[PDB]
Design a protein around this ligand. Structure first.
Ligand SMILES: CCCCCC/C=C\CCCCCCCCCC(=O)OC[C@H](COP(=O)(O)OCCN)OC(=O)CCC/C=C/CCCCCCCC
Ligand SMILES: [Cl-]
Ligand SMILES: [Fe+2]
Ligand SMILES: [Mg+2]
Length: 658
């Protein structure tokens, strides 16, 4: 063959992954610098590297199933998950496959059992190799550099295993689809225990507590006057809250809180949506009022309107225990709210506002901040696995007949467009935790005492903020250093432009830079954790929450039966997909906020700059503060009606990778 083919003959992806892994340890010995403080050789090299980065990290707004959302055109080799994440994730998926196959009719399970057994054995073998390599490294630290190649080869093996897992899952889903009171909603769990919510789901106080301690703590807002389209009367309010209370005094005393799902748009179809796989489905854009008692101990649900127009949707009011003719209509109205909730939570709060925001910051960072830029060094750990998991969301979860088409009532094209639109409209500054709390008038613990997301979230927000401030102060001596940084300027430009981050604006000083970095890091780590990790314990049991109902909203508060409510429950296929996807997505904890070490071998420090890593220095102070936050949250959870554990720093990954 031609002599110019010589370099291509033996070139392969594994070899290149090894090179990428070793080069990253080597590059990381370069002391970080702002471009204006770098020497000319450094300026030349960093500009060359950034130009090459743009070949690898490429924007598109036409990615499959997420049209209009800025995405990576493809995931670079160096952005594939490391073997630690691959093993964890493969472990969970294989466990779930084995569990599901065990519940299938024996004849239909025979071949899947054998294949699943083989995959489980291969996974165990891979785990054993991982353990043996780690042991080798501990026993001979001097050989760590050469052992890295064996970890890269193990990565190849686990990638191959997960490819085989993918083929099996596709076959199992087809078989399941052909095959498939409340017993069926327990049966889909197989060997898995029901989540805690299965015990409490019909309780009204539990239902209200979701608004401040559930997967979507962002929608609830204080109201000073009821909306014109929510015509609840004084008599209705007194029936629930007492003869000596009133709407006027509850409003004035900051005791009224509203959930209004108007923003769902096409995620709340106007009527029935018939699909071949799942039959007739419905979802809703309801309005619900909650109130604190005069002692402010906790929220109670007061009233629910199952749609936006009161002319066509009657008012459901919380019934007394004796009012058996109102009991089931009320359960149905709460189900309407929970259906809206899964749509709002998963498509907006989780997918659009964590995952799809962090996608843009990852791409901008890699394309415009040199690897030797201190902000690249800081931010990159917070995007580990983000491009990969988001390509997975688009390719695997969002196509026709996939998990989201099954589990969410709307037509899949409407779901995609509405989630994408929500991402495009999400204002970066307004979406900051403190701004969100203030805008919704839920920031004052005197007004609303029990709001665990706020109280724990602010501890984590403020810890990150002080870290960002300390870190910025190491590199930027003044606002002039901020505006003179041409890489930061390009980064801001890419975030505004190609990244389509609403509300993003030029960064002109250190205080603003700190706020921006706080939000980027918080969004990647804590916010994602708070809205992702409740999935297994709160969202796996369909009668407590599901993004589709098999029946319309109740047409009357009076006269409904248990049968009427049961008709809202989803088909078994929806319940099966739900338990499995939500167990998976909340069962992989990879990396930890504040650790700042590689999450794969050789687990090296992220930071080489002695000013950052000094004893008692910025990083140590951040880590110490997170440990104080952990203690404070653990103490709070001893006093709370139920523990809220999603913002414990020990359970917050550094990045959005699941
Ligand atoms: C739902 C709302 C989510 C909202 C937001 C989500 C955002 C981010 C999450 C994105 C997650 C992306 C998907 C998961 C990522 C898992 C890690 C991963 O990347 O795995 C890659 C493998 C192979 O890839 P490949 O392209 O070769 O072939 C895909 C199938 N043709 O994919 C899977 O095993 C699919 C598992 C699907 C889950 C099955 C559940 C367990 C099966 C048990 C039996 C099921 C019986 C029914
Ligand atoms: Cl269809
Ligand atoms: Fe997630
Ligand atoms: Mg058998």
């Amino acid at each position: 063959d031609s002599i110019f083919f010589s370099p291509l003959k033996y070139l392969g992806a594994e070899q290149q992954r090894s090179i990428d892994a070793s080069r990253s340890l080597l590059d990381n010995l370069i002391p970080p610098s702002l471009p204006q403080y770098d020497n000319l050789a450094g300026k030349l090299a960093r500009r060359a590297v950034l130009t090459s980065k743009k070949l690898v990290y490429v924007w598109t707004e036409n990615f499959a199933n997420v049209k209009g959302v800025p995405m990576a055109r493809s995931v670079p080799l160096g952005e594939l998950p490391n073997v630690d994440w691959l093993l964890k994730t493969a472990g969970v998926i294989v466990e779930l496959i084995v569990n599901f196959v065990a519940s299938l009719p024996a004849s239909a399970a025979a071949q899947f059992e054998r294949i699943a057994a083989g995959l489980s054995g291969d996974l165990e073998a891979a785990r054993q190799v991982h353990e043996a390599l780690l042991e080798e490294a501990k026993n001979d630290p001097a050989a760590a550099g050469s052992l890295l190649l064996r970890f890269t080869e193990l990565q190849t093996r686990v990638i191959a295993l997960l490819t085989r897992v993918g083929l099996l899952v596709d076959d199992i889903l087809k078989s399941a689809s052909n095959l498939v009171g409340l017993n069926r909603f327990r049966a889909v769990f197989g060997t898995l225990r029901l989540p805690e919510v299965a015990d409490s789901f019909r309780d009204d106080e539990a239902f209200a507590y979701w608004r401040v301690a559930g997967p979507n703590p962002l929608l609830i807002r204080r109201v000073d006057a009821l909306p014109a389209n929510f015509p609840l009367g004084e008599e209705q309010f007194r029936r629930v809250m007492g003869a000596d209370d009133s709407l006027l005094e509850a409003a004035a005393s900051r005791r009224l809180y509203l959930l209004d799902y108007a923003e769902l748009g096409k995620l709340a179809p106007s009527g029935a949506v018939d699909k071949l796989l799942t039959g007739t489905g419905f979802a809703y854009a309801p309005i619900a009022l909650f109130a604190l008692g005069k002692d402010r101990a906790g929220l109670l649900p007061v009233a629910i309107q199952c749609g936006q127009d009161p002319a066509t949707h009657p008012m459901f009011v919380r019934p007394a225990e004796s009012e058996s003719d109102l009991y089931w209509g009320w359960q149905m109205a709460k189900t309407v709210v929970q259906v809206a909730e899964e749509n709002y939570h998963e498509m907006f709060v989780h997918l659009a506002q964590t995952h799809l925001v962090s996608e843009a910051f990852c791409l901008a960072t890699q394309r415009t901040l040199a690897p030797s830029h201190p902000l690249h060094v800081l931010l990159a750990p917070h995007f580990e696995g983000t491009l990969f998991i988001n390509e997975g969301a688009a390719r695997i979860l969002l196509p026709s007949a996939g998990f989201i088409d099954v589990m969410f009532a709307a037509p899949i094209q409407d779901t995609q467009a509405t989630a994408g639109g929500n991402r495009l409209g999400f204002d970066f500054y307004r979406g900051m935790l403190p701004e969100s709390l203030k805008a919704r008038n839920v920031d004052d613990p005197a007004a609303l005492p029990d709001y665990p997301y706020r109280d724990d979230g602010l501890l984590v927000w403020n810890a990150i903020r002080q870290w960002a401030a300390d870190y910025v102060a190491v590199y930027y001596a003044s606002d002039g250093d901020v505006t003179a940084d041409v890489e930061l300027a390009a980064w801001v430009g890419e975030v505004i432009g190609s990244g389509k981050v609403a509300g993003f604006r030029p960064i002109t000083g250190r205080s603003q830079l700190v706020e921006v970095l706080t939000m980027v890091i918080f969004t990647a780590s804590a916010q994602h954790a708070a809205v992702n990790f409740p999935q297994p314990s709160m969202m796996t049991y369909a009668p407590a929450i599901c993004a589709m109902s098999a029946a319309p909203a109740p047409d009357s508060p009076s006269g409904k039966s248990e049968a009427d409510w049961l008709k809202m429950m989803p088909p078994t296929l929806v319940a099966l997909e739900k338990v499995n996807i939500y167990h998976l997505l909340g069962s992989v904890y990879h990396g930890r906020l504040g650790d700042y070490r590689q999450t794969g071998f050789p687990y090296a420090p992220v930071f080489s700059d002695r000013r950052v890593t000094a004893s008692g220095g910025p990083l140590e102070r951040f880590q110490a503060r997170l440990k104080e936050v952990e203690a404070t949250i653990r103490t709070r959870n001893q006093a709370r009606r139920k523990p809220y554990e999603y913002l414990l720093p020990s359970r917050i990954p550094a990045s959005t990778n699941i």
